[PDB]
Structure formats: structure tokens, C-alpha cells
Write a protein that binds this ligand. Sequence first.
Ligand code: NAG
Ligand code: NAG
Ligand code: NAG
Ligand code: NAG
Ligand code: NAG
Ligand code: NAG
Ligand code: NAG
Lengths: 50, 198, 44, 172, 38, 84
Amino acid sequence: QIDRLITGRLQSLQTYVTQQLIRAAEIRASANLAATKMSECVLGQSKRVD
Amino acid sequence: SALGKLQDVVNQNAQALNTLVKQLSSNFGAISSVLNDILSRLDPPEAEVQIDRLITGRLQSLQTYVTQQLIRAAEIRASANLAATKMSECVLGQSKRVDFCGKGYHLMSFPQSAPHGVVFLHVTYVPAQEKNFTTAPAICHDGKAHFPREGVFVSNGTHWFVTQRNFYEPQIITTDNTFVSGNCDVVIGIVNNTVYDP
Amino acid sequence: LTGTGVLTESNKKFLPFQQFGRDIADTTDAVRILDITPCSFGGV
Amino acid sequence: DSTECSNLLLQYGSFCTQLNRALTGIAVEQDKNTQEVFAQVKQIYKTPPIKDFGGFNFSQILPDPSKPSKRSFIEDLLFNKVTLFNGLTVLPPLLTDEMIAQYTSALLAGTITSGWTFGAGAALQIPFAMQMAYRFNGIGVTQNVLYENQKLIANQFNSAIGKIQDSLSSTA
Amino acid sequence: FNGLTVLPPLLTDEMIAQYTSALLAGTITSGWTFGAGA
Amino acid sequence: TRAGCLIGAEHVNNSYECDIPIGAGICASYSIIAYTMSLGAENSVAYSNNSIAIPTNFTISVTTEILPVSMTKTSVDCTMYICG
Ligand SMILES: *[C@@H]1O[C@H](CO)[C@@H](O)[C@H](O)[C@H]1NC(C)=O
Ligand SMILES: *[C@@H]1O[C@H](CO)[C@@H](O)[C@H](O)[C@H]1NC(C)=O
Ligand SMILES: *[C@@H]1O[C@H](CO)[C@@H](O)[C@H](O)[C@H]1NC(C)=O
Ligand SMILES: *[C@@H]1O[C@H](CO)[C@@H](O)[C@H](O)[C@H]1NC(C)=O
Ligand SMILES: *[C@@H]1O[C@H](CO)[C@@H](O)[C@H](O)[C@H]1NC(C)=O
Ligand SMILES: *[C@@H]1O[C@H](CO)[C@@H](O)[C@H](O)[C@H]1NC(C)=O
Ligand SMILES: *[C@@H]1O[C@H](CO)[C@@H](O)[C@H](O)[C@H]1NC(C)=O
């Protein structure tokens, strides 16, 4: 029974880690976009539309 | 350690591969981590249930490795898209974007090959050796407001010249490089000076 | 200890008290000295 | 804290090391993202005590000596509006709120004093009217348009900031 | 050795170096003109 | 500190560039010292409504940027890996 519980809890932890990794990738992309915006609009004037 | 990104990517890939290789030899609750020993030692029913346990463990490990590899591949694809954009903009032309192709006013870029990446040598222009000057938005001459076409009005201590923004090249204020727009009553900070007519 | 592979002359030096030898991944590499190198395999 | 779990997990493998490494890498990545986003400059510029920007008002976005964690009123509203065992722990960020706020203050001072010159090297002082004239020239509008409507543009900017703070105050 | 293979890259190191050299030569000898046509 | 407690490093009242990031604004560097990392050089720009600063010289700066383009292509035979 303990082994079954271990397998279930480890599977749950794997799912949580995968979700966290996907969210981290999304947040990294958003942070790269924000850094680009700060570089090209706060440190200078951007001719790009919108 | 000047190529930390490529070395880090290689180290992560090697670490994932080594972790998978190590996990290949895990008991996973079975009597042994060697399949051949189980087959040459144990009866077909118990041998196949141990095989099922080992298969479950190894399949879970391989699934985890494949998920991490897919995430790393997506990250590498994003990095390669950024590198291709830099190649198209910084190398094949001149980019007006700030700090996209190096710190300062970007001049050009040179590509260099790397074992698992690319290197951009960004050649840029950086102002230095600055001096203070006194400015005025416009010049009130003959009851008319004169603004510089390109550059800025400055004065060292008493004489007013017109120069360019990024370099100190003073020039005599003249009607060719200045344009008139209205009188000198609405401009805030306008000063009185002569405008040379050639 | 059963397995499938190629028996090769080994240039490595064992010890009188050592019988088996395993490289990285904890897999059988040498058996008493003869080296075990699996026969060629790959994709097509 | 059961010994049987350790006994049954040592033979299971090393997935715990994998998860710990993944979490550490994620934390390092977020720290690097914050470091890249907020630390665009290596010099902490400060606004001069006298504020004569041609009528433009920046006391709304500049820090005040009242010590509200060294944040502007808009930053205070942004912080206030956002509302926030068993082996789970929260690692504090490398850059604190005060440090990020001081980065923001330095960036604001550089933008409102040196324009875009500090982003390409040393900060170069320039009157805000002339910086706005340069920016108007960037979008294809001559300097005289700014110079003959400086008061109107300053009033419009102040009104826009007022609507911004009103929206951030009541509108959710 | 356990079913793990490393697939060689399609483009060799020499070919990547030749791409970099060609791009650099076009940049020096032509500027940005070669990136928008002849 | 709010990130925990550190033993073996002497706390100093100075501020240097961060070397080993401990967290919560606290860094460590090499005896081993622990401090609060400095954001950078602190300077005040002489702003005025009738003053400008214009460069009289220039510098041609060459910087290096590293960008990964690809990684090693690994193929795994599931039947061989799991079963052998
Ligand atoms: C000249 O400008 C610098 C800033 O670049 C300032 O520190 C200095 O005080 C100025 N000189 C005078 C005489 O005010
Ligand atoms: C300013 O420059 C003009 C022209 O070069 C010169 O005649 C004048 O003496 C200068 N004044 C000062 C204070 O350097
Ligand atoms: C600059 O501000 C001072 C007040 O400190 C004022 O006396 C002066 O007329 C102003 N000059 C311009 C050009 O706005
Ligand atoms: C410039 O000259 C006009 C008349 O010549 C005068 O009315 C005006 O006050 C002068 N400007 C300044 C700043 O003294
Ligand atoms: C800017 O706005 C604030 C709040 O409305 C006000 O207290 C301050 O006096 C204004 N500054 C200027 C220079 O008008
Ligand atoms: C504490 O910091 C202050 C200010 O930096 C300094 O004057 C003082 O010497 C420091 N004391 C110690 C014990 O480090
Ligand atoms: C600019 O700096 C270089 C050396 O970096 C020097 O040789 C040159 O004379 C300087 N320019 C001026 C106008 O002094």
C-alpha cells in the first residue's frame, strides 16, 4: 500500500513540476518581451507601430 | 567562461542523458535491476510481473526525459529565432532598436561560428569626452523665431553657434541651417542673437 | 551471469580478488580477463 | 519522516534529484529574468532637487521623501491593488521590492533628464523641452509645434496622468 | 550503448564556417545591399 | 536575514557587486564576507533648463554576444532502452 501511495504521490509531483516548467517558460517569454520593451521604449524612441 | 550559455546547454543535455543512463539501472521495486538475471532466475509468471514493474519504471523515466527534452528544444528554438532575427537585422543591415545589437549606437555586426551556437561581434558608437554648453530653444532675430533644421543651439561663454546632437561641431548660425516659424513671443526660453544671412 | 555480446582480449589489469568489472551505468563490462563488447547494432 | 519511505525510495531511483534540479533551474531563470528586465543601467541617477521640466509634472511617478518603501504613488496603488508545512518552501527573490523600486527611480531620472543618451552610454543633461522637441522630430513633427504649444502639451500630459491615476484608483 | 545514439548535424562545422565567412565578406564588401538583393 | 541564517561569513556594512547570490538582497563574496549587493555607481546629473552636455569625442566599441542555435540531436530506441 505504501508503494502504491509513493507511485501516486510521485506522479502528482511530476505533473506539478511539468506545469511549473511550462509556466516558467511562459513567464520567461513574457519577461524577455518586457525587457525588449524597456530597452527600446524607455531607453530610446521606438519607430515600431503599436 | 565567456561562452557560458553554450556550455550550460551542453552540460544540461549531458546531465539529462547521464540521469537517464543511471535510471536505466534502478530496481523500481523489483528483485533486481538486471532483466537477464530475472529471466535466467525466475519463473515466467513472476518474471513477467517483475518485467511489468521494470517497464513501468523505465517508461516513466523515459517520459520524464522526453518532456524535459521537449521543453529544452522549445527554449532552444526560441533562442535560435532570436539569433536569426539578430542575424537578419544586426548583420544584414543597420538596426535603430536600442541595445538590440549591442550597447550604444549600433554600427554593424559580424557573425562567427560556434560549436552549438553563434557569436555576434557588435561594433557600436559610444559618445565620450563631453562638455557643458548653454542652449536656447530658438533665436529671436528681427522679431522672428528661428529654430535649427538639424542640431542644437549652444554657446561656450558668449558666442552662439549651431551644432549636431551627437558630436560637437559648432557652426555659425545662418539662414540656411535655420528655419523661421512665427514670432519670438510664444517660445519659452528664447534668447536674442544675430542670424547671419549669406 | 548470462548475456549476449562479443568476447575480446582485454588490455586492462585486474586484481586476484576481482572477478567482474563494471564501467559507468553499472553494467557488465569485463568477466573473468575478457572484455564484453556488444555486437554492432543501430537504426536503419 | 518515515524510514520506510527512504527505504522504498532509494531503490526507486533518483527522481527527487531531478525535481530539485528543475526547481533550482527555474528559480535561477526567474532571478536572471528579473535581473535582465529591471537592471538596464549600472548607474543610479537621481532627480535634481529643483523640478523645472517646462511645466511637465513628474512628482506623480517620482519617489517622495515620505518613505513609502521608496515607491511612487502609482507604484503604491499597484502594490496595494494586487493581493497575495509539507516540504514546500518559498525562496525570497534576489532583488527586493526596494531594490527594484530604486532601479525604477534611476530609470525615470535618466529618462526625464538625459533622454535616450544614458541608454547609449554616459548620461547627457538636456532640458525636457528640448528632449520633447527631439522626440517630436522623431515622429516627423517639427520643433515649433512643441515650442508654440508647450503649455497645452504639458497640461494634456498632466491630465492624462490624472486619468491614469483615477483609473488605477477606482477601476478594477 | 543502450539504444542511445547521437545523430550528426546536417550542416558540418566547415559549412557553418563557410556561411559565416560568406556573410562577413558580403557585409564588408557590400554593406546591407546584399541583404536586400544583388 | 529574511532568507534564513548564515554561519561562517562575517557581515560587513559595505556594499559591493554581487558575487554569490544568497537572496533577499544579500550576497556573499571572498575570508568569506556577506553584505548587501550594491546596485551600481551613485551619481547626480547636473540638470538645468538652459544647460546641455555634448560629447567632443567618440569610441568604437566591439562587444561579444553568444546565442545558442541548436543542441545535440539524441535518438532513443524505447524497445532497446527498456528491454535490451
Ligand atoms: C558640467 O557638467 C557636469 C555634468 O556632466 C557637472 O557635474 C558640472 O558641475 C558642470 N559644470 C559646471 C561648471 O556646472
Ligand atoms: C567662444 O568661441 C568663440 C569662437 O570660437 C570665441 O571667439 C570666444 O572667445 C569663445 N568664448 C569662450 C568664453 O571661450
Ligand atoms: C530657468 O529657471 C530659472 C529659475 O531657476 C529661471 O530664472 C530662468 O529664466 C529659466 N530659464 C529658461 C530658459 O527657462
Ligand atoms: C530682445 O530684443 C527685443 C527688442 O530688440 C526686446 O524687446 C527683448 O526684451 C529682448 N530679449 C531679451 C531676453 O532681453
Ligand atoms: C504635481 O501634482 C501634484 C499633485 O496634483 C501637486 O501637488 C504638485 O504641486 C504638482 N507639481 C507642479 C510642478 O505643478
Ligand atoms: C556600519 O555602517 C556604517 C555606515 O556604512 C559605518 O560607518 C560603520 O563603520 C559600520 N560598522 C561596522 C561595525 O561595520
Ligand atoms: C579622442 O580620443 C583619442 C584617443 O582616444 C585622441 O587621440 C583624440 O585626440 C581625441 N579627440 C580630441 C578632439 O581630442
